Amino acid sequence: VQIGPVTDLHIVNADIVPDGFVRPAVNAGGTFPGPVIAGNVGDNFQIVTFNQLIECSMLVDTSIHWHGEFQKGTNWADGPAFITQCPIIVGNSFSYNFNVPGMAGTYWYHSHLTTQYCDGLRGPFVVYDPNDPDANLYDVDDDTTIITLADWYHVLAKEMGAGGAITADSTLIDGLGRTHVNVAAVPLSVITVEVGKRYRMRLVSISCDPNYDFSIDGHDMTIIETDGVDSQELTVDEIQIFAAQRYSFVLNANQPVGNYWIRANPNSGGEGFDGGINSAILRYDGATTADPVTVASTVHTKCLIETDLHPLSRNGVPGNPHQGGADCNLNLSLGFACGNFVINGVSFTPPTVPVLLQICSGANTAADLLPSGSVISLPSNSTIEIALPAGAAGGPHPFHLHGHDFAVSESASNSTSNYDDPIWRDVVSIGGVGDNVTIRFCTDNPGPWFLHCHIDWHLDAGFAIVFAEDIPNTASANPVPEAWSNLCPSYDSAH
Numbered sequence: 113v114q115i116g117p118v119t120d121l122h123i124v125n126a127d128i129v130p131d132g133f134v135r136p137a138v139n140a141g142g143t144f145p146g147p148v149i150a151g152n153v154g155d156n157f158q159i160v161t162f163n164q165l166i167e168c169s170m171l172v173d174t175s176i177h178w179h180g181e182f183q184k185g186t187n188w189a190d191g192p193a194f195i196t197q198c199p200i201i202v203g204n205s206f207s208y209n210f211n212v213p214g215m216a217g218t219y220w221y222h223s224h225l226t227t228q229y230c231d232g233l234r235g236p237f238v239v240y241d242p243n244d245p246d247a248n249l250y251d252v253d254d255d256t257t258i259i260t261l262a263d264w265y266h267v268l269a270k271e272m273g274a275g276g277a278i279t280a281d282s283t284l285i286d287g288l289g290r291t292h293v294n295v296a297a298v299p300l301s302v303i304t305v306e307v308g309k310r311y312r313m314r315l316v317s318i319s320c321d322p323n324y325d326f327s328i329d330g331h332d333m334t335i336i337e338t339d340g341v342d343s344q345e346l347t348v349d350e351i352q353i354f355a356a357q358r359y360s361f362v363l364n365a366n367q368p369v370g371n372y373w374i375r376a377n378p379n380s381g382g383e384g385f386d387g388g389i390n391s392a393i394l395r396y397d398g399a400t401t402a403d404p405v406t407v408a409s410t411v412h413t414k415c416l417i418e419t420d421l422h423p424l425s426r427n428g429v430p431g432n433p434h435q436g437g438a439d440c441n442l443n444l445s446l447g448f449a450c451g452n453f454v455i456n457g458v459s460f461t462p463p464t465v466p467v468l469l470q471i472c473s474g475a476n477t478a479a480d481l482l483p484s485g486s487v488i489s490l491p492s493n494s495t496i497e498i499a500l501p502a503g504a505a506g507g508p509h510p511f512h513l514h515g516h517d518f519a520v521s522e523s524a525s526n527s528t529s530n531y532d533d534p535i536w537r538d539v540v541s542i543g544g545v546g547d548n549v550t551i552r553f554c555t556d557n558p559g560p561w562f563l564h565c566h567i568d569w570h571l572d573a574g575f576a577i578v579f580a581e582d583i584p585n586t587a588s589a590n591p592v593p594e595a596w597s598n599l600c601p602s603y604d605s606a607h
């Protein structure tokens with residue numbers, strides 16, 4: 113189902129059994145995954161979030177992030193708890209009111225309090241472009257062609273320990289999937305196609321953790337969009353998609369009428385596809401209603417390599433074509449030790465007063481800002497470079513920057529930089545020990561922007577910092593509505 117751009121979104125508890133195991137959940141709009149929130153580029157989104165949560169087990173406070181939306185002028189609407197807001201308390205509501213100029217493509221939204229999105233608050237967000245330059249490449253683009261991949265846990269997020277390696281109990285594709293252990297023959301998701309039609313498939317990782325090896329038996333996939341950025345056409349036969357990344361790919365339904373397995377292998381949890389784990393069904397109209405009996409290629413011969421992606425537009429790369437060729441070049445020391453992650457020796461632990469409120473109240477510098485050592489100021493209109501050398505305990509970490517997308521100057525498993533035409537995205541794997549994944553952007557968006565690993569268990573264990581971008585201009589650029597000012601006093605009173 114699609115809603116928006118102006119809509120109510122209620123946050124409720126519901127028990128669900130996507131793999132046959134009933135357990136509690138935190139739902140947006142009453143379904144798992146949440147409904148698709150949608151609009152056209154340039155639309156005013158007004159999402160009134162009614163928090164009706166009752167089950168403390170998963171926290172009754174909530175806060176929602178519109179993942180990959182830049183929020184320029186509306187840093188207050190971004191969603192991360194204690195960075196841009198206090199959580200909305202149960203029984204109250206809050207209007208995330210914002211515009212999406214410049215932006216089109218496939219996004220998503222999720223709770224950004226603690227590890228609550230794991231417990232089910234996650235869904236797709238699609239900005240349609242009525243003048244999409246990729247339109248002529250396909251026949252069908254609609255709600256039936258969105259594909260979500262989700263990790264699902266039998267253990268309540270708040271009780272995951274932490275961290276402490278943690279693994280999912282099943283993979284859900286469009287909210288259905290089978291349990292990795294003691295697999296019950298529960299219903300699988302079906303994605304129906306018609307002989308000869310081309311589909312814009314919108315592949316969305318809503319994962320709290322694992323990355324997926326994604327393929328469709330018998331079929332190719334032509335990538336045309338990455339984390340919201342239009343790409344040149346890239347035909348692959350397998351896609352490794354890390355947590356919170358998105359691809360649009362063209363599926364040409366050119367195989368014989370029949371049933372073909374859709375495969376998404378997580379990097380942890382259940383391995384293989386026995387009894388239909390890690391699986392969904394590609395069904396052609398006219399096929400018999402039966403399980404596919406297809407096999408993956410023994411070796412995939414054209415799997416996605418990030419370095420083969422190129423923007424469709426002439427995005428290029430900011431700065432100079434050498435490492436340090438930026439106004440403010442950074443190299444973050446990403447560590448793990450004793451159950452906590454650090455960035456430059458500091459583990460993130462949420463401040464009592466949100467970063468933005470601190471600024472609104474008169475803070476001027478990162479030194480003025482709490483938590484100490486968890487904030488780095490950026491000057492305005494400057495080319496930033498962030499090197500993110502990997503090695504820290506597992507791995508591979510998908511880093512995400514709020515309020516921005518970014519050139520991937522250097523990708524995983526490859527030490528050659530690209531200062532001509534690398535793909536731009538918003539979530540990138542930092543690869544493995546010895547890699548030096550590097551990103552670049554321009555500071556054109558005043559506000560405190562979260563930078564964190566999108567493995568949510570790694571976020572709760574401190575793997576994050578705030579880029580306080582243009583502290584001096586922050587208040588002026590981001591006028592807040594009174595409802596936002598009301599958040600922290602309510603939350604603090606309630607607690």
Ligand SMILES: *[C@@H]1O[C@H](CO)[C@@H](O[C@@H]2O[C@H](CO)[C@@H](O)[C@H](O)[C@H]2NC(C)=O)[C@H](O)[C@H]1NC(C)=O
Pocket residue numbers: 435436441442443499501546547548550
């Ligand atoms: C990965 O990339 C960064 C560059 O973006 C490298 O940073 C250099 O590091 C050395 C020592 O750490 C400094 O003396 C230089 O000033 C840095 N060069 C700059 C900032 O241009 C970093 O060493 C690399 N990390 C690796 C390969 O793990």
Ligand SMILES: [Cu+2]
Pocket residue numbers: 177179180222356512566
């Ligand atoms: Cu996110």
Ligand SMILES: [Cu+2]
Pocket residue numbers: 177178179180512513514515
């Ligand atoms: Cu985000």
Ligand SMILES: [Cu+2]
Pocket residue numbers: 506507508509510565566567570575
């Ligand atoms: Cu991580």
Ligand SMILES: [Cu+2]
Pocket residue numbers: 177192224512514562564
């Ligand atoms: Cu985030």
